[PDB]
Amino acid sequence: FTPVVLATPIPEEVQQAQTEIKLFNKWSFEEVEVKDASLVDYVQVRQPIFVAHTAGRYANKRFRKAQCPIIERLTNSLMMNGRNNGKKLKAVRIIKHTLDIINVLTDQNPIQVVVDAITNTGPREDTTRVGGGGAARRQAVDVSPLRRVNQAIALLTIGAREAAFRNIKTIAETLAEELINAAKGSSTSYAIKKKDELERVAKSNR
Amino acid sequence: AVPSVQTFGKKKSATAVAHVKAGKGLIKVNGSPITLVEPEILRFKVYEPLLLVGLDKFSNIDIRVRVTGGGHVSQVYAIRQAIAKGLVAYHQKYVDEQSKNELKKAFTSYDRTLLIADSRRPEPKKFGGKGARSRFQKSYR
Amino acid sequence: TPVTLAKVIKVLGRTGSRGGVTQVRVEFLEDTSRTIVRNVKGPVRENDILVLMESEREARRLR
Amino acid sequence: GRVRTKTVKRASKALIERYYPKLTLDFQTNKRLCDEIATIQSKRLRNKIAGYTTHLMKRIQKGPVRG
Amino acid sequence: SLVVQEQGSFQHILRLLNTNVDGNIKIVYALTTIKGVGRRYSNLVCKKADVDLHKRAGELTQEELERIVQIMQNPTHYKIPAWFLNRQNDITDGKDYHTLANNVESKLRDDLERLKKIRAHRGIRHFWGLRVRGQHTKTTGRRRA
Amino acid sequence: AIRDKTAGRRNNRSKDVTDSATTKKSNTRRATDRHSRTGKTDTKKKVNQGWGDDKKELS
Amino acid sequence: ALISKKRKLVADGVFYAELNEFFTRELAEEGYSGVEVRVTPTKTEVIIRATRTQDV
Amino acid sequence: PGVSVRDVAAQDFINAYASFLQRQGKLEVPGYVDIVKTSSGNEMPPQDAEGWFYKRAASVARHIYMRKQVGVGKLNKLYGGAKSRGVRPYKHIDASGSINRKVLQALEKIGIVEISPKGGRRISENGQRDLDRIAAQTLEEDE
Amino acid sequence: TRKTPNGEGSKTWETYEMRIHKRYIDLEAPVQIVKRITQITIEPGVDVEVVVASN
Amino acid sequence: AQHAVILDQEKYDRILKEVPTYRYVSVSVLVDRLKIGGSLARIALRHLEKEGIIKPISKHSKQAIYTRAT
RNA sequence: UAAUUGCGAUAACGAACGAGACCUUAACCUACUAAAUAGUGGUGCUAGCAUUUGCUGGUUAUCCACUUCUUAGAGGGACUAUCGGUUUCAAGCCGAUGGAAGUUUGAGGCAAUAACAGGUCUGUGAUGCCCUUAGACGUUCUGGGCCGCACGCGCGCUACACUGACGGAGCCAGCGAGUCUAACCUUGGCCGAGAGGUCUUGGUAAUCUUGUGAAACUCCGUCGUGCUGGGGAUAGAGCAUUGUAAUUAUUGCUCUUCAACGAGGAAUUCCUAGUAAGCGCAAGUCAUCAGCUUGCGUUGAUUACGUCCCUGCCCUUUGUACACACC
Ligand SMILES: [Mg+2]
Ligand SMILES: [Mg+2]
Ligand SMILES: [Mg+2]
Ligand SMILES: [Mg+2]
Ligand SMILES: [Mg+2]
Ligand SMILES: [Mg+2]
Ligand SMILES: [Mg+2]
Ligand SMILES: [Mg+2]
Ligand SMILES: [Mg+2]
Ligand SMILES: [Mg+2]
Ligand SMILES: [Mg+2]
Ligand SMILES: [Mg+2]
Ligand SMILES: [Mg+2]
Ligand SMILES: [Mg+2]
Ligand SMILES: [Mg+2]
Ligand SMILES: [Mg+2]
Ligand SMILES: [Mg+2]
């Protein structure tokens, strides 16, 4: 990679990787393609990022929220349950740990495994409460792509934050677990069960 | 005198002043090498300008930055801005234009407001609540 | 299990008494030249892609 | 929601009325006109005024405009 | 640190000072199941008895235990500051004591009786099972008695 | 004070809460606010003398 | 002397307040409209603006 | 190449200078150590037992190495932390003016710090020497 | 300050403020012009304070 | 009190023979195999690192990780 | 449209108050004027490490130069600009590019006509009438009382822990405020475990406290799911501070005591971006006392960018025997 040194030294794998490939903590944004139709444009992956933290303005407009890098969309939704409100440094490290955990098992750039668990828990259709006179039936509705990524993000983190509650396993161990089961969905994960149950109730009224 | 430029960058309150002079390539933050900087998960945020434009850009220039004010994160975003603004301010007055408009182009592409100071800022809270938007609580009767 | 992909052609409006539901016409990208108007749940712009789980049915109004 | 007041749309009326052989569809020069040609009490009202007389100017070039 | 081995040497649940103490907890918080010995007081005593806090209450050579008991009921002889002590300047003899185990219940009786026998308002308040320390009793303190 | 029985927690704890403890605002006269109780009224002379009347406006 | 700049100008205003009061009661029948107080070397000048000076 | 202590990371310098001050044996470690709590706004004494006076001596050193002059009071405020007031909100609280003043005195008796004019305590000319030394010695472990 | 004289209403707070601006200008001159310059340039509402020396 | 506070010589050798095939080993994972509370569990992590087996690809307090030896 | 904000329709035309304009604050000025009460580089004097020049500090004037940073004067700047979609091609809306900034730029100040027996005679030496006026409802002085506890309601603070407590360690803000005829903000040196004490010190303040070295937070360890070291009520014992006075414990420290609470029924509050929430700080009060309040910055999300289902109110049409106006 044609190394270099000026006065204050820059470490070797730091010197190396960045200049060549612009990659994660260390992980590949190349390859890692969204495994389901749609869900692209609504999952980021390129532009690549070093670590998930940003000053990003994703609020000011309706759909620029989707343009947020997807991993930071996963970290952002970690830090909450108001004791943890704020504390993105807390979450970012849990994610780096989490990714390292998933990486350990079954190879697979874990950023891609994260891409897989999001695609696999998004409900294709759901139900809402129609008035229709008081006692309210359920008009099944297909749900938007943005709400399929959003709900997956919320469903995954919540199920791990709720499971990791009151036990030795760390958040990053359950976060990774919950993702590992949902990357190819095994229906052992909190998230998958709720996805399949919503899609069951939507099928059961129509 | 040697060729030098001063720059700065700001995030929230934090202001990070920079000095870019022709030199052997030290990169230092307040007293210390850019390889410390910790919070340390954020470290690559301040690495970012060196890497996006390639590490060889710093061999003819010395880099020092002092961050007063802000907080343990805003300081990291204030420095990285002064570093990139300083690298581009140097090719403004010293090496030619086409090299500078090539640097801005490759910071702006990726970016995170690297040449451009973010506008966000605390809103004043107002009476009736503990927050800016937040009101307190009411039970009616 | 027959996935049915459909591209939002236009945005018709917000139904439901609540108003979270949107009315949209969709051209399925596998065999175009045929259209269905659907009810969505989350937010939607032009040229999105819904997954219709069952291909033939549609609604209009929501109370 | 940006909707110009009547004082803005009223002043743009009289300006394009008598000063059309002057101005342009460039905001910046029209702004400087409203200094030398007109007495306004603030910088903001003037950019607002001139900005709208620029718009009314911009569409008179294609089709007439009532008023 | 070090993976240790031992054999059969350590016993779980060893009794001292008329109370029962589980082994397999780290010895500093083990002694806290006696009354009158706080986390700080346990910590100072073991630092004084030349014991390793790294150890549990499990291992703890029998000799180390009697030493540990000794310092507890004789704090001022073993160079313990006496502002570290739950009874300073006594009430009658004025000596500084650390009242230990089932004895701290006694002195609670002792003092409470002192105020009552004297008819001081503080004892009057304990007699009625109220809050002595002077907090408002209107709202707080309902389930209680 | 200590000798007297019928004192202290345990004694009150065994009595019963009056139902006046759980009562409400009581409000006592709102819907009469607009209705003047004085029974005076005023008169049209005494107001026109003080505040002037619309019939003398010219002068 | 020796009073801080902040506490100075504050007290300077309170001094004006107590001043304008005392005249508005005293000059009422004289049409007292206000004052101003100019501070100089040698002197502190107080101008009573009323509508009737021959009475003041 | 030349070396400062600013060229070394925060903790590995204070871990090294702790082991060094521990290896030494020339200390003055006042002796209420192990019995004291370091702050009113604390709960338990340090888990270092024998130790942590070297840790704070090292810490105090590098802090005075950095800057012009700092006192006992500054070190209390610096070393203090949030006190849990029980059922009432947290408040910042200063740490002990004894531990620090005795750390300054000991490190002055050992000649790493001197009583600076204008006030406070300044890094010693001999402290620069020896601190820059062990700094490099830790950078050199990474060689 | 609360706007209300007494107790009642949604609690409205109204903050008054007074702004104090302070300048200083350093001159080197003789005794005569210092007195000529200080007696005149008198203005009501502005507080001029002329100190002396270097310490 | 529920077992995992101590050594129990049969347990030491269990750790020896039971940690291949673990792609994951850490504080939690050590307790998960029905043993070693998080005090002595952490000690096995530094000790299995004395030689062989666990590879230190993870750093710090709370989260730990190691894979098999090669 | 946020707006009787506009377009348009037009027996109306053309205006005024109010909205807007305006004002204040936060964002942008390597352009303007400057700064030992702000700060940078060069230079001496100088310490440490290295030495090849280097790296990292000391030094209210030993000098020179500068104004990027800080401060605040005068100006500049944005007018939803450019282009494109959308629409009566109207006011407008939406998207993209550029921009310090494009949600009324963000947030406030000011705010017409009118109404209410809203609150306030307990802010006033504003006040009518009534009452009392020396065994006083005047006034002061001693002591108590507003805190009194079977219990109902509301605002809150701390938790139920492992995204955690604890112990080392890294170490980063902004709004403030401070003593004259006086004892305010306190650096530093000692002594003390702490609370504190004590000898001095700068500051009427961008000059000193103070870089307010704040807290969350980051790092390395200890504990390991057990009402546990989560939690800190209750209580005993001692030491200090304010105050003439601390008992019904003003506040602070030390030891011990180690409760309830294992995420909370019906219900119900608040909130759309540097917002919510988590986190402290300063100011108010203040001799002493914040679990309150007014402002402040730190860390910093999820989810809408829609509708009338609920609740609330505004507008039309309509009825009226009301107009002291459905009390
Ligand atoms: Mg105990
Ligand atoms: Mg701190
Ligand atoms: Mg600390
Ligand atoms: Mg019209
Ligand atoms: Mg107006
Ligand atoms: Mg400037
Ligand atoms: Mg842009
Ligand atoms: Mg009334
Ligand atoms: Mg009266
Ligand atoms: Mg009261
Ligand atoms: Mg901690
Ligand atoms: Mg317990
Ligand atoms: Mg605790
Ligand atoms: Mg005070
Ligand atoms: Mg206060
Ligand atoms: Mg109050
Ligand atoms: Mg009618």
Side-chain angles (χ1 to χ4, degrees), chain E residues 32-77:
Chain E
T32 50
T33 68
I34 323 171
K35 302 313 165 65
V37 280
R39 260 147 41 102
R40 291 297 324 273
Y41 194 86
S42 169
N43 191 264
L44 183 56
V45 155
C46 307
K47 292 173 154 184
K48 286 304 197 59
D50 202 21
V51 196
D52 238 20
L53 323 316
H54 284 90
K55 301 191 178 184
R56 323 304 288 241
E59 26 241 1
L60 261 268
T61 80
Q62 291 281 316
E63 166 179 359
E64 284 180 297
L65 294 176
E66 297 111 21
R67 287 215 306 257
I68 283 180
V69 175
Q70 232 289 275
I71 310 187
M72 268 188 290
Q73 66 231 140
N74 269 107
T76 190
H77 295 8

Coordinates of all heavy atoms in Angstrom, one line a residue, chain E residues 32-77:
Chain E
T32 N -20.4 -9.3 56.9 CA -21.4 -8.3 57.0 C -22.8 -8.9 57.4 O -23.7 -8.2 57.8 CB -21.6 -7.5 55.7 OG1 -21.7 -8.4 54.6 CG2 -20.5 -6.6 55.5
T33 N -22.9 -10.3 57.4 CA -24.1 -10.9 57.9 C -24.1 -11.0 59.5 O -25.1 -11.5 60.0 CB -24.2 -12.3 57.4 OG1 -23.2 -13.2 57.9 CG2 -24.2 -12.3 55.9
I34 N -23.1 -10.5 60.1 CA -23.2 -10.2 61.6 C -23.7 -8.8 61.7 O -23.6 -8.0 60.8 CB -21.8 -10.3 62.2 CG1 -21.0 -11.5 61.7 CG2 -21.9 -10.5 63.7 CD1 -19.6 -11.6 62.1
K35 N -24.3 -8.5 62.8 CA -24.9 -7.2 63.0 C -23.9 -6.3 63.7 O -23.1 -6.7 64.6 CB -26.2 -7.3 63.9 CG -27.2 -8.2 63.4 CD -27.5 -7.9 61.9 CE -28.3 -9.0 61.2 NZ -29.7 -9.1 61.7
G36 N -23.8 -5.0 63.2 CA -22.8 -4.1 63.7 C -21.6 -4.0 62.8 O -20.8 -3.1 63.1
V37 N -21.4 -4.9 61.8 CA -20.2 -4.9 61.0 C -20.6 -4.5 59.6 O -21.3 -5.3 58.9 CB -19.5 -6.2 61.0 CG1 -18.7 -6.4 62.2 CG2 -20.6 -7.3 61.0
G38 N -20.3 -3.3 59.2 CA -20.6 -2.8 57.9 C -19.6 -3.1 56.9 O -18.5 -3.7 57.2
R39 N -19.8 -2.8 55.6 CA -18.9 -3.1 54.5 C -17.6 -2.4 54.8 O -16.5 -3.0 54.6 CB -19.5 -2.6 53.2 CG -20.1 -3.7 52.4 CD -21.3 -3.2 51.6 NE -21.1 -1.9 51.0 CZ -20.7 -1.7 49.7 NH1 -20.6 -2.7 48.9 NH2 -20.6 -0.5 49.2
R40 N -17.6 -1.2 55.3 CA -16.3 -0.5 55.7 C -15.7 -1.2 56.8 O -14.4 -1.4 56.8 CB -16.6 1.0 56.0 CG -17.0 1.9 54.8 CD -15.9 1.9 53.8 NE -14.6 2.0 54.4 CZ -13.9 3.0 54.8 NH1 -14.5 4.2 54.7 NH2 -12.7 3.0 55.4
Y41 N -16.4 -1.5 57.9 CA -15.9 -2.1 59.1 C -15.3 -3.4 58.8 O -14.2 -3.8 59.4 CB -16.9 -2.1 60.2 CG -16.3 -2.4 61.5 CD1 -15.9 -1.4 62.3 CD2 -16.2 -3.7 62.0 CE1 -15.4 -1.6 63.6 CE2 -15.7 -3.9 63.3 CZ -15.2 -2.9 64.0 OH -14.7 -3.1 65.3
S42 N -15.9 -4.3 58.0 CA -15.4 -5.5 57.6 C -14.1 -5.3 56.8 O -13.1 -6.0 57.1 CB -16.4 -6.3 56.7 OG -15.8 -7.4 56.1
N43 N -14.0 -4.3 56.0 CA -12.9 -4.1 55.1 C -11.6 -3.7 56.0 O -10.6 -4.3 55.8 CB -13.2 -3.0 54.1 CG -12.1 -2.9 53.0 OD1 -11.2 -2.0 53.1 ND2 -12.2 -3.7 52.0
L44 N -11.8 -2.8 56.9 CA -10.7 -2.4 57.7 C -10.2 -3.6 58.6 O -9.0 -3.7 58.8 CB -11.1 -1.2 58.6 CG -10.0 -0.7 59.5 CD1 -8.8 -0.3 58.6 CD2 -10.4 0.5 60.4
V45 N -11.1 -4.4 59.1 CA -10.7 -5.5 60.0 C -9.8 -6.5 59.3 O -8.8 -6.9 59.8 CB -11.9 -6.1 60.6 CG1 -11.6 -7.6 61.1 CG2 -12.4 -5.3 61.8
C46 N -10.2 -6.8 58.1 CA -9.4 -7.8 57.3 C -8.1 -7.3 56.9 O -7.1 -8.0 56.9 CB -10.2 -8.3 56.1 SG -11.9 -8.9 56.6
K47 N -8.0 -6.0 56.5 CA -6.8 -5.3 56.2 C -5.9 -5.4 57.4 O -4.6 -5.4 57.3 CB -7.0 -3.9 55.7 CG -7.7 -3.8 54.4 CD -8.1 -2.3 54.1 CE -8.1 -2.0 52.6 NZ -8.4 -0.6 52.3
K48 N -6.5 -5.3 58.6 CA -5.7 -5.3 59.9 C -5.3 -6.7 60.3 O -4.2 -6.9 60.9 CB -6.5 -4.7 61.0 CG -6.6 -3.2 60.9 CD -5.2 -2.6 60.9 CE -5.3 -1.1 61.2 NZ -5.9 -0.9 62.6
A49 N -6.1 -7.8 59.9 CA -5.8 -9.1 60.4 C -4.8 -9.9 59.5 O -4.5 -11.0 59.8 CB -7.1 -9.9 60.5
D50 N -4.3 -9.2 58.5 CA -3.4 -9.8 57.5 C -4.1 -11.0 56.9 O -3.6 -12.2 57.0 CB -2.0 -10.2 58.2 CG -0.9 -10.4 57.1 OD1 -1.0 -9.8 56.0 OD2 0.1 -11.0 57.4
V51 N -5.1 -10.7 56.1 CA -5.9 -11.7 55.3 C -6.0 -11.1 53.9 O -5.9 -9.9 53.7 CB -7.3 -12.0 55.9 CG1 -7.9 -13.3 55.3 CG2 -7.3 -12.0 57.4
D52 N -6.1 -12.0 52.9 CA -6.2 -11.6 51.6 C -7.7 -11.5 51.2 O -8.4 -12.5 51.3 CB -5.5 -12.6 50.6 CG -4.5 -11.9 49.8 OD1 -4.0 -10.8 50.1 OD2 -4.1 -12.5 48.7
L53 N -8.2 -10.3 50.9 CA -9.5 -10.1 50.5 C -9.9 -10.9 49.2 O -11.0 -11.2 49.0 CB -9.8 -8.6 50.3 CG -9.2 -7.6 51.2 CD1 -9.3 -8.0 52.7 CD2 -7.8 -7.2 50.8
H54 N -8.9 -11.2 48.4 CA -9.0 -12.0 47.2 C -9.7 -13.3 47.6 O -10.5 -13.9 46.8 CB -7.7 -12.3 46.5 CG -7.2 -11.1 45.7 ND1 -6.4 -10.2 46.2 CD2 -7.3 -10.8 44.4 CE1 -6.0 -9.3 45.3 NE2 -6.6 -9.7 44.2
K55 N -9.4 -13.8 48.8 CA -10.0 -15.1 49.2 C -11.5 -14.9 49.5 O -12.0 -13.8 49.7 CB -9.3 -15.6 50.5 CG -7.8 -15.8 50.4 CD -7.3 -16.5 51.7 CE -5.8 -16.8 51.6 NZ -5.4 -17.6 52.8
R56 N -12.2 -16.0 49.5 CA -13.6 -16.0 49.9 C -13.6 -16.2 51.4 O -12.6 -16.4 52.1 CB -14.4 -17.1 49.2 CG -14.0 -17.3 47.7 CD -14.0 -16.1 46.9 NE -15.4 -15.7 46.6 CZ -15.9 -15.5 45.4 NH1 -15.2 -15.8 44.4 NH2 -17.2 -15.2 45.3
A57 N -14.8 -16.2 52.0 CA -15.0 -16.7 53.3 C -14.8 -18.2 53.4 O -14.9 -18.9 54.4 CB -16.4 -16.4 53.9
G58 N -14.6 -18.8 52.2 CA -14.5 -20.3 52.1 C -13.2 -20.8 52.7 O -13.2 -21.7 53.6
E59 N -12.1 -20.3 52.2 CA -10.8 -20.9 52.5 C -10.3 -20.5 53.9 O -10.4 -21.3 54.8 CB -9.8 -20.5 51.4 CG -10.0 -19.2 50.7 CD -10.2 -19.3 49.3 OE1 -10.2 -20.5 48.8 OE2 -10.4 -18.3 48.6
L60 N -9.7 -19.3 54.1 CA -9.6 -18.7 55.4 C -9.1 -19.6 56.5 O -10.0 -20.1 57.3 CB -10.9 -18.0 55.7 CG -11.0 -16.5 55.4 CD1 -10.5 -15.7 56.6 CD2 -10.1 -16.1 54.2
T61 N -7.8 -19.8 56.6 CA -7.3 -20.7 57.6 C -7.9 -20.4 59.0 O -8.1 -19.2 59.4 CB -5.8 -20.5 57.7 OG1 -5.4 -19.4 58.5 CG2 -5.1 -20.4 56.3
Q62 N -8.2 -21.4 59.8 CA -8.8 -21.3 61.1 C -8.2 -20.3 61.9 O -8.9 -19.5 62.7 CB -8.9 -22.7 61.8 CG -9.8 -23.7 61.1 CD -11.2 -23.5 61.4 OE1 -11.6 -23.2 62.6 NE2 -12.1 -23.6 60.4
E63 N -6.8 -20.2 61.9 CA -6.1 -19.2 62.7 C -6.6 -17.8 62.3 O -6.8 -16.9 63.1 CB -4.6 -19.3 62.5 CG -3.8 -18.2 62.9 CD -2.3 -18.4 62.8 OE1 -1.9 -19.5 62.3 OE2 -1.5 -17.5 63.1
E64 N -6.6 -17.5 60.9 CA -7.1 -16.2 60.5 C -8.4 -15.8 61.0 O -8.7 -14.6 61.2 CB -7.0 -16.2 58.9 CG -5.6 -16.1 58.3 CD -5.7 -16.0 56.8 OE1 -6.1 -17.0 56.2 OE2 -5.2 -15.0 56.2
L65 N -9.3 -16.8 61.2 CA -10.7 -16.5 61.7 C -10.7 -15.9 63.1 O -11.3 -14.9 63.3 CB -11.5 -17.7 61.5 CG -11.8 -18.2 60.1 CD1 -12.6 -19.5 60.1 CD2 -12.5 -17.1 59.3
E66 N -10.0 -16.6 64.0 CA -10.0 -16.1 65.4 C -9.3 -14.8 65.5 O -9.8 -13.9 66.2 CB -9.2 -17.1 66.3 CG -9.9 -18.5 66.4 CD -9.1 -19.6 65.7 OE1 -7.9 -19.4 65.5 OE2 -9.7 -20.6 65.3
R67 N -8.3 -14.5 64.7 CA -7.7 -13.2 64.6 C -8.7 -12.2 64.2 O -8.8 -11.1 64.8 CB -6.5 -13.2 63.7 CG -5.2 -13.9 64.2 CD -4.0 -13.2 63.7 NE -4.0 -13.0 62.2 CZ -3.2 -13.8 61.4 NH1 -2.5 -14.7 61.9 NH2 -3.3 -13.6 60.1
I68 N -9.5 -12.5 63.2 CA -10.5 -11.6 62.6 C -11.5 -11.3 63.7 O -12.0 -10.1 63.8 CB -11.2 -12.2 61.4 CG1 -10.2 -12.1 60.2 CG2 -12.5 -11.6 61.1 CD1 -10.8 -12.6 58.9
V69 N -12.0 -12.3 64.4 CA -12.9 -12.1 65.5 C -12.3 -11.1 66.6 O -12.9 -10.1 67.0 CB -13.3 -13.4 66.2 CG1 -14.2 -13.1 67.4 CG2 -14.0 -14.3 65.2
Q70 N -11.1 -11.4 66.9 CA -10.3 -10.6 68.0 C -10.4 -9.1 67.7 O -10.9 -8.3 68.5 CB -8.9 -11.1 68.0 CG -8.4 -11.4 69.4 CD -8.2 -10.2 70.3 OE1 -7.2 -9.5 70.3 NE2 -9.3 -9.9 71.1
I71 N -9.9 -8.7 66.5 CA -9.8 -7.2 66.2 C -11.2 -6.6 66.2 O -11.4 -5.4 66.6 CB -9.2 -7.0 64.8 CG1 -7.8 -7.8 64.8 CG2 -8.9 -5.6 64.5 CD1 -7.0 -7.5 63.5
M72 N -12.3 -7.4 65.9 CA -13.6 -6.8 65.8 C -14.1 -6.3 67.1 O -14.6 -5.1 67.2 CB -14.6 -7.8 65.2 CG -14.7 -7.8 63.7 SD -16.0 -8.8 62.9 CE -15.3 -10.4 63.2
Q73 N -14.0 -7.1 68.1 CA -14.5 -6.7 69.5 C -13.4 -6.0 70.3 O -13.7 -5.7 71.5 CB -15.0 -8.0 70.2 CG -13.9 -8.9 70.5 CD -14.2 -10.3 70.1 OE1 -13.3 -11.1 69.6 NE2 -15.5 -10.7 70.3
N74 N -12.3 -5.7 69.7 CA -11.3 -4.8 70.4 C -10.7 -3.8 69.4 O -9.5 -3.9 69.0 CB -10.2 -5.7 71.0 CG -10.5 -6.1 72.4 OD1 -10.8 -7.2 72.8 ND2 -10.4 -5.1 73.3
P75 N -11.5 -2.9 68.9 CA -11.0 -2.0 67.9 C -10.0 -1.0 68.3 O -9.0 -0.7 67.6 CB -12.3 -1.3 67.4 CG -13.2 -1.3 68.6 CD -12.9 -2.5 69.4
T76 N -10.1 -0.4 69.6 CA -9.2 0.7 70.0 C -7.8 0.2 70.3 O -6.9 1.0 70.3 CB -9.9 1.5 71.1 OG1 -9.1 2.7 71.3 CG2 -9.9 0.6 72.4
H77 N -7.7 -1.1 70.7 CA -6.4 -1.6 71.0 C -5.5 -1.9 69.7 O -4.3 -1.7 69.7 CB -6.5 -2.9 71.8 CG -7.1 -2.8 73.2 ND1 -7.7 -1.6 73.6 CD2 -7.3 -3.6 74.2 CE1 -8.1 -1.7 74.8 NE2 -7.9 -3.0 75.2

